[PDB]
Design goal:
Radius of gyration of chain A: 37 Å
Keywords: abcb6, heme transporter, membrane protein
CATH class of one domain in chain A: Alpha Beta
Bound molecules: protoporphyrin IX containing FE, cholesterol hemisuccinate, glutathione
CATH architecture of one domain in chain A: 3-Layer(aba) Sandwich
PDB class: membrane protein
Entry title: Cryo-EM structure of the human ABCB6 (Hemin and GSH-bound)
CATH superfamily of one domain in chain A: P-loop containing nucleotide triphosphate hydrolases
Number of helices of chain A: 22
Helix content of chain A: 55-70%
Distance between the termini of chain A: 79 Å
Structural class of chain A: alpha/beta
Assembly: dimeric
Strand content of chain A: 5-15%
Oligomer: homodimer
Largest sheet of chain A: 4 strands, parallel
Strand order of the largest sheet of chain A: 2-9-8-5
Shape of chain A: elongated
Largest interface: A-B, 113 and 112 residues
Chains A, B: ATP-binding cassette sub-family B member 6, mitochondrial
Chain lengths: 591, 591
């Protein structure tokens, strides 16, 4: 009693996992599946008993008909039970085929749960962890839980149960010494298998690691084809690749040899047990203590026990690795940040459109605070701009306005309504934003510009395309609206991406339009046509913008200049030139 | 005789493949391995004969000692042959362990051959094919050839051979009707397996394709986390993912059910054959025509035949897919471009350093020729520049100078030496070039700036680092020279990349230094320090450059302006301003 209470709640949670909590018929499928597994374990003893009975009736003179009937019964059981390999039988195969429905339900439920829980985390969690490996953890976790349940319920517990049935049949119906032989032989076999597998796993993991390094050495060398052509180094690249190959062979040989040693040890143990049992059984049956078929029964029973026990090592490794992998996935599932939550849940009301700041500090980086009590306010229809010395402070201002991160000390309200207790669905309904640079994922134009809401209609979406004028390029595409777009599809322009963005935010029709402008190269005339479209979508809508151009500065109804989280200049475009602060110096460098 | 002559030369080439053409002992290993395979096929008949002999001596009254000796011999053969037919016995396992050396030689040779042949192709071939899939073809080809040889030599030919031995043993030593039963049963079994597998492969491939699509729908949705957070579409993303899951289940169920049907058909056929054989054998042995152990012999022989024949379907699929995959790899191996080759092989001599052009046209794009008879010449030490209206013509001029592509009509010589018959090793020895933007692959600084030649020494490479002044940033790294660098390693600056480039070309010490400048953002003072380093490495060296800045234009000793492959302006910086062509207009827009 050392490792008992730790595994209990985890095994209880997995016990909750396999049983469908609400499904009507799936639980019946589970019960009938376990019933078939039990009946197959019955067949594993009831076949060779009939074999002994056949050879007993044959070895003495018997009538033809009764012997024929029992032979038919024997070959019938050799059909219902598997011919060999604990599979290939009308009972185990029907168990597998009838089992395949519940695995679908289990996999779908667990994997959709983990997918929703990845989309519920906050932004700050994702920027820390490498996104290229969380995916692997989740996928391997789902495959791990289905594999672990399948293996450890249907191919390890039945085998050990069959060992126990075996020791009992021999002890109760044969001499005790036969039970001693089978017991000692199978216990020794299991102990040798366990020890050698836990020794061999080191070579296994070292081989895998070196394999992933050698393959990478090559993909990169071919991809940098241009550089290796430059520097006249083909022979050097080939030689270094050969060295990586040689090291990989030097590990793989060790792994394969260890496998052979394990296999030969197992075979020797079963052969030794078979020799002892066959000799002793022969001695009794030639001393008239037993019957002729008992030797045949013992031979076929040892072979029948050995055939599924041969695959014990790989089950042991796979249960170990999926167990630790489920532990990692379960750890990630319990991990949770969700900074934006309040149980009061008072959704936002839109009545004016006033954006007011009140003395808020902020530190997404630890220690270095990037906000010193900035405070301003706007009226409905007001257009604000934010330009100053280079820094991510304005971008963080937008992101904290969007309830990505949290205020540190202070509060920001919209229309005098505190944003702390508002549901985020209500907030992201009221707000809308064209970003830095949009990313358009692999789909057609039609649904991707329908993406602004679920209920987007066809007439509405062609109406919005006419509103923001993509239709010329859309007809310039081969099939038009059904054009496949993305990394799989066609490459587009950054101006086209901003056109997509203004289309989908038109479809959203937000209260306040936020903008975040990039340094994408475009001619000024088309840039200002896009600016006119943004001006008309923000017409009678309050607007906060970051800008980099002179017109995009001078359009401001309330400019603001900040650096390192503090307000330094304010007013308008003409007033700050007459003031001649850093605005006047920056304006000459924008020429 | 329809598909005989087509397979002959391919099978002859694979016959050349397995046999090592020069190795002394590997051929001996191959012969001893085939000898062990033959002896194992002998054991597969010699075991159950002894089983029948044991039960025959047991069923009559026999002395203890002789029976004990033959029982020991039987269990001994059950050790040498697999306890369970398959790879579980000393005769076969030693074959696998002793075989593992020749597979290393085969895999290393074929995969290094294909790697060298990918590095021998020209540049124009790579820009056409997607590089993201040639890699898959090569890797799967090498794994295909080793798998195909292993499967089709060691687990299909032996099984069919064992079937033939079986029909003969029964026909020659038993009644002819037993041979008829085993023949008809195994022929029917093979035909059913073949037909059902070739029917099932459709569901297999459809399941794989839908699987790769569903997974991709998810990785992209998580990666665009920011956009899906913007547009308030978590529930929509989850729902669309659930639809993809449901379609995937709707295919996977069909595949699994087809597998179950195949397995049950196989088991039913073997069970039916076993029933017919056991009944008829029982009738003869109760009519005194045979001996008691003949029933036992037939039962164990049918089980021994069935146990390896159960795995026929997956061998059939895997031989089919690796066969077509080896065909693809072999097609790619025979594919070859190698535009730069002449058997005369007259290497370049460097005596002056004069670069002369003589009336050459060029068309890397078909039809649209991008070179109209450009011709000029330089003296040793001359510095040339190439700036004009935007176009890839200058870049192609450098690339054709480097013997990437070919001249179309005309010739270009260096120092009056024709570059057509020069060996490319001689050319790339004499020439050196700093490129557009270098790529530095995953290694340390030390060998990556040693990369300019194989014989790079430690004192030389620290000397070159002192020469080009990276040493301050190198000590600014954590451990200094052993810093791991790349995508795995640290990110660096573009100026640092150009420093690496000037270091490795210093180490090369070429005749003519070519440069190709990018639009990387850098301050002018450090840019001109880098320019001074390039000026001193090209000091007393002829130089051809593309430029974008005023100083990088006015340094030219012989300027040249081209557009769409034709020469339009020439002279120097001052002369073309006085001429006032497109040079004067472009110079005002460079301000
Ligand atoms: C889903 C679980 C399984 C996996 C992942 C698996 C994996 C593999 C793989 C990758 C091979 C190719 C040969 C190799 O890699 O050396 C293979 C072959 C084989 N598997 Fe499985 N297998 C599984 C289930 C089973 C079961 C249940 C059995 C029967 C007890 C079995 C018996 C075999 C046999 C006899 C071979 C051929 C060995 C040879 O040709 O040398 N496998 N398996
Ligand atoms: C979930 C798993 C662990 C269930 C395992 C079930 C076994 C522990 C038991 C339950 C029913 C038992 C069977 C019940 C009846 C029979 C028939 C019996 O055949 C006879 O000839 C007995 C009657 C007689 O004396 O005539 C031989 C044992 C056997 C197969 C028993 C073998 C052991 C079995 C399979
Ligand atoms: C459903 C498909 C797969 C066909 C399955 C057929 C079997 C169920 C048949 C075929 C051969 C039959 C056997 C053929 C001959 C005999 C001898 C026969 O002997 C007598 O009738 C004794 C003399 C008498 O009383 O007339 C008893 C039935 C038996 C064992 C038969 C039992 C039923 C068997 C196994
Ligand atoms: C390494 C693994 C395979 C275990 C091997 C153990 C055997 C070497 C041992 C354990 C059980 C022993 C047997 C247990 C009981 C008996 C019965 C015993 O019988 C009598 O004493 C009288 C018999 C009679 O009068 O008929 C003779 C020794 C013998 C065969 C023993 C011989 C040696 C055996 C087979
Ligand atoms: C697949 C390729 C490599 C061909 C493989 C051929 C073997 C499968 C054959 C060839 C010769 C055969 C043997 C020829 C003669 C005998 C003796 C035969 O009887 C005896 O052992 C003694 C008989 C007597 O007393 O005369 C048992 C089968 C055996 C070993 C045969 C087993 C199968 C063998 C090895
Ligand atoms: C190498 C390691 C794995 C040990 C292997 C041991 C076997 C080779 C031994 C152990 C038991 C032995 C058997 C034990 C008893 C007998 C009875 C013995 O009967 C006699 O006739 C002997 C006495 C006499 O001469 O009258 C003949 C040898 C035999 C079969 C022995 C043959 C050799 C065996 C199988
Ligand atoms: C579906 C697959 C598994 C094929 C099944 C074929 C059987 C239904 C056939 C083929 C071989 C036939 C046997 C071939 C030869 C004989 C011996 C023949 O013997 C005699 O004529 C006299 C025997 C004597 O006097 O001892 C009786 C019929 C029988 C058993 C035949 C019965 C029907 C068999 C088993
Ligand atoms: N949460 C996703 C994860 C999907 C996933 O991880 N897919 C694999 C390919 S089958 C992958 O891209 N692995 C990440 C890697 O190892 O690069 C899911 O389970 O659907
Ligand atoms: N009999 C051995 C091996 C049985 C076997 O055939 N397993 C195969 C897999 S199908 C194996 O070990 N291959 C290497 C691996 O799985 O890593 C054991 O005790 O596990
Ligand atoms: N020629 C290389 C090719 C290596 C290769 O193709 N590796 C695989 C991974 S095992 C890869 O790059 N896959 C790319 C992909 O799947 O897109 C070799 O055989 O060593
Ligand atoms: N008995 C079946 C299957 C035998 C078997 O165990 N094969 C496994 C692979 S280890 C299988 O079919 N798995 C599914 C697959 O390979 O697609 C046959 O006729 O091939």
């Amino acid at each position: 009693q050392s490792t008992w209470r730790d595994f209990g709640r985890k095994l209880r949670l997995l016990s909750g996992y396999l049983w469908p909590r609400g499904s009507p018929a799936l639980q019946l499928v589970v019960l009938i599946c376990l019933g078939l597994m039990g009946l197959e374990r019955a067949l594993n003893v009831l076949v060779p008993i009939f074999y002994r009975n056949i050879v007993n009736l044959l070895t003495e003179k018997a009538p033809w008909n009764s012997l024929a009937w029992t032979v038919t019964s024997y070959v019938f059981l050799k059909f219902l039970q598997g011919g060999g390999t604990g599979s290939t039988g009308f009972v185990s195969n029907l168990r597998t085929f009838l089992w395949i429905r519940v695995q679908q339900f289990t996999s779908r439920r667990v994997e959709l749960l983990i997918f929703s829980h990845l989309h519920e985390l906050s932004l700050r969690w994702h920027l820390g962890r490498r996104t290229g490996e969380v995916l692997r953890i989740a996928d391997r976790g789902t495959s791990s839980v289905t594999g672990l349940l399948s293996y450890l319920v249907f191919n390890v517990i039945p085998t050990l149960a069959d060992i126990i049935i075996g020791i009992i049949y021999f002890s109760m119906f044969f001499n005790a010494w036969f039970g001693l032989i089978v017991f000692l032989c199978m216990s020794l076999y299991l102990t040798l298998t366990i020890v050698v597998t836990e020794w061999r796993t080191k070579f296994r993991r070292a081989m895998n690691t070196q394999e992933n390094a050698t393959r990478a050495r090559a993909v990169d060398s071919l991809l940098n084809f241009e550089t290796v052509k430059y520097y006249n180094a083909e022979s050097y690249e080939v030689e270094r690749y050969r060295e990586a190959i040689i090291k990989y062979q030097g590990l793989e040989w060790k792994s394969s040899a260890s496998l052979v040693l394990l296999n030969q040890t197992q075979n020797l143990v079963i052969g030794l047990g078979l020799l002892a049992g066959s000799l002793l059984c022969a001695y009794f049956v030639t001393e008239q203590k037993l019957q002729v078929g008992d030797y045949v029964l013992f031979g076929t029973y040892i072979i029948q026990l050995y055939m599924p026990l041969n695959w014990f090592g790989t089950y042991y490794r796979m249960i170990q690795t999926n167990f630790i992998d489920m532990e990692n996935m379960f750890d990630l599932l319990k991990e949770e940040t969700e900074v934006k939550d309040l149980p009061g849940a008072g959704p936002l009301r839109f009545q004016k459109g006033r954006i007011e700041f009140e003395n808020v500090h902020f530190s997404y980086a630890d220690g270095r605070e990037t906000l010193q009590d900035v405070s301003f306010t706007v009226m409905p229809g007001q257009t604000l701009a934010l330009v100053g010395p280079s820094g991510a402070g304005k971008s963080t201002i937008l992101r904290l306005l969007f309830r990505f991160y949290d205020i540190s000390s202070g509060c920001i309200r919209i229309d005098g309504q505190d944003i702390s207790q508002v549901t985020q669905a209500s907030l992201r309904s009221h707000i809308g934003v064209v970003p830095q640079d949009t990313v358009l994922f692999n789909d057609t134009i039609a649904d991707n510009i329908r993406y602004g809401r679920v209920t987007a209609g066809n007439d509405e979406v062609e109406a919005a395309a006419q509103a923001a004028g993509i239709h010329d390029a859309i007809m310039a595409f081969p099939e038009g609206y059904r054009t496949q777009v993305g990394e799989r599809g066609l490459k587009l322009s950054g101006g086209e991406k901003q056109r997509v963005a203004i289309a989908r935010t038109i479809l959203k029709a937000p209260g306040i339009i936020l903008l975040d402008e990039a340094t994408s190269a475009l001619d000024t005339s088309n840039e200002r046509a896009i600016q006119a479209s943004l001006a008309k979508v923000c017409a009678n809508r309050t607007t906060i913008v970051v800008a980099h151009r002179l017109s995009t500065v001078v359009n401001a109804d309330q400019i603001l200049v900040i650096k390192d989280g503090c307000i330094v200049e304010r007013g308008r475009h003409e007033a700050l030139l007459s003031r001649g602060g850093v605005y006047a110096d920056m304006w000459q460098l924008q020429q």
